[PDB]
Write an enzyme that holds these catalytic residues in place. Structure first.
Site, short mmCIF file in Angstrom:
data_model
loop_
_atom_site.label_atom_id
_atom_site.label_comp_id
_atom_site.label_asym_id
_atom_site.label_seq_id
_atom_site.Cartn_x
_atom_site.Cartn_y
_atom_site.Cartn_z
N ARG A 190 0.80 -1.27 -0.02
CA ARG A 190 -0.01 -0.15 0.07
C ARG A 190 0.79 1.07 0.15
NH1 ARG A 190 -2.99 -1.83 4.46
NH2 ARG A 190 -4.25 -3.66 4.24
N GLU A 206 1.83 -9.31 14.64
CA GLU A 206 1.26 -9.96 15.80
C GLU A 206 1.75 -11.18 16.11
OE1 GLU A 206 -3.17 -9.38 15.09
OE2 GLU A 206 -3.44 -10.93 16.67
#
Ligand code: CL
Ligand code: CL
Lengths: 181, 182
Positions: B65, B102
């Site tokens: 992105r 994560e």
């Protein structure tokens, strides 16, 4: 494009002999991205080609596609629509499978991003087999988009991609032709 | 600087998806901004205006992105764009930095020849969350002798501590659209 513009772009691209394997000459657009003039010229020539074509959306595949589709969308003053690897887009998607050497992968698009009445330009870094672009044209048309045009920085004219896309009714516009597989 | 109306237009252009990617979270979806030619052009034009006198010699953006925001800012500034990529995608000699996710770690790579002493780099990304990838990107740039003091973002998730993390590296963050949550 003038011969001067086309040779400057060809000369801006590094070719890595025997990358990723012997006999394969990798055409590296990163040397073009880092050169202010070569990058700007690549985008300006694509915008000039399509400015009168009634384009309403530009589609680019992840990830090198993004580097050329997104600036062309901004230059045309139309939205940019990413086609992505699976599980990255957050809203409703449709998916198309394309073949690779030892299996398959998928590309996804947001269903809401292309509507009937949209005229779409696909933009990618490099035309090789055309498999990803063939799948992207299938996604666009499933959403009622009209697509007749694909634009590339590089075309590997030995690998059949332009003729593959012509079987879908796609005209390819490419800035830099290179041989090799 | 950006007008209050321009900032409100950008904030209204971004869709928020309830319970994605997990329940109770509001995912800030920049693809709706990409689809709106007014919001996308406005975002790029504002970032170019902010840095036009900052002596920037190169823009770096992280895959994927990040490419959608850093490359148009590089073209607006009229400087080179350098991608920082997931491993094994850049074809020439690289260096690598590890960062946290994560559920473990991963690496980002840069071409060793893409940043030189004398370069002053602007990092541009879609969204500031933990800041881990930008922290790794700053380490890459400085390993090559580049100076970097500036990171710019479309979205800042101000609850996640990213801006303060990047201040510990001497980075000033500029963001167009702040949101609470993840
Ligand atoms: Cl690359
Ligand atoms: Cl982050």
């Amino acid at each position: 494009a003038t011969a001067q513009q086309l040779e400057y772009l060809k000369n801006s691209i590094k070719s890595i002999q025997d990358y990723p394997k012997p006999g394969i000459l990798f055409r590296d657009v990163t040397s073009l991205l880092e050169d202010p003039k070569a990058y700007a010229l690549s985008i300006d020539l694509l915008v000039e080609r399509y400015k009168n074509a009634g384009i309403t959306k530009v589609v680019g595949t992840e990830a090198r596609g993004f580097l050329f589709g997104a600036p062309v969308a901004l230059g045309l003053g139309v939205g940019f629509v990413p086609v992505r690897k699976p599980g990255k887009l957050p809203r409703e998607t449709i998916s198309e499978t394309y073949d690779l050497e030892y299996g398959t992968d998928q590309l996804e698009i947001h269903v809401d991003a292309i509507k009937p009445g949209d005229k779409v330009l696909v933009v990618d870094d490099l035309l090789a087999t055309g498999g990803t672009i063939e799948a992207t044209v299938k996604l666009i048309r499933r959403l009622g988009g009209e697509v007749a045009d694909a634009a590339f920085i590089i075309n590997l004219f030995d690998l059949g991609g332009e003729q593959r896309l012509e079987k879908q009714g796609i005209t390819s516009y490419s800035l830099v032709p290179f041989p090799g597989h």
